[PDB]
């Protein structure tokens, strides 16, 4: 073997996390009792802590969680091998950037892929973000994503947000400053890793197709299972709550108050 991070930049970012830790909010997560998903769209989950019921924004929590995991396992990440025997299933960066109508010319998409591609040795070494070129080295339109970092055992992120990941890696990351660049990449990985927003679908609407129904039901189930078996156990075991997250944790009920209305027969 495991690589020791000699780097001054990673240590400054780890200290910055240490300085933002809210002790009381961290204790709430450390001793959480998971209740369930409230909203798969807005990404709200309900947890019990002692005598209270909390409404949590897990979009915000997974963001800091994956950011923290990224900071700890930096340069020692496992890989999610994204390639199969099916060459047609490959992930082409140029193809992903085509989702952005504002990148209205091949050159603007090529600009983004060029920066990412020039930094492929470090993206692979430090982040396990492996990019490969199938044709000639200068063919940006044939630049492919072969591996992603494996942040949490039992977790494989949805790749629906891959277009945003590449677009933000190419436009938001300050590649010029070591610390800002490194922080930026960890933030991009954390953003991609957050479970997707699942919009609400009306199961009573006869106007909506039969295949769209069982598909919403499957997405609804996949998240509930993810949160309950993978995410919340990890959150409960290692999550350090930053103070900026107090807005994302809301007390909704308390047992003393409930037990004044709900009573034994």
């Amino acid at each position: 073997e495991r690589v020791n991070v000699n780097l001054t930049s990673i240590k400054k970012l780890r200290e910055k996390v240490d300085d933002s830790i809210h002790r009381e909010l961290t204790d709430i997560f450390a001793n959480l009792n998971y209740v369930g998903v409230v909203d798969e769209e807005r990404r709200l989950a309900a947890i019990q802590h002692d005598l209270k019921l909390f409404l949590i924004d897990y979009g915000s929590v997974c963001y800091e969680l994956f950011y923290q995991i990224g900071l700890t396992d930096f340069a020692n990440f496992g890989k999610i091998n994204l390639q199969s025997t099916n060459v047609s299933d490959d992930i082409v960066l140029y193809n992903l950037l085509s989702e952005f109508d504002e990148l209205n010319d091949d050159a603007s998409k090529e600009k983004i892929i060029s920066k990412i591609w020039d930094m492929s040795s470090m993206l692979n070494e430090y982040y396990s973000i492996e990019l490969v070129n199938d044709g000639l080295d200068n063919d940006l339109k044939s630049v492919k994503l072969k591996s992603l970092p494996l942040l949490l055992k039992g977790y494989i992120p949805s790749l629906v947000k891959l277009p945003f990941f590449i677009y933000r890696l190419g436009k938001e990351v300050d590649w010029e400053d070591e610390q800002e660049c490194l922080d930026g990449i960890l933030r991009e990985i954390a953003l991609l890793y957050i479970p997707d927003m699942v919009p609400k679908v009306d199961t009573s609407d006869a106007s909506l197709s039969e295949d769209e129904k069982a598909q919403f039901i499957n997405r609804k189930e996949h998240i509930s299972s993810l949160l309950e078996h993978v995410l919340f156990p990890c959150i409960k075991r290692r999550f350090l709550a930053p103070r900026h997250i107090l807005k994302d944790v809301v007390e909704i009920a308390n047992l003393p108050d409930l037990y004044k209305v709900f009573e034994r027969c």
Binding site: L7, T8, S9, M122, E178
Partner: peptide
């Protein structure tokens, strides 16, 4: 320590 990738 600074990163070889940054010069």
């Amino acid at each position: 320590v600074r990163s070889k990738y940054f010069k």
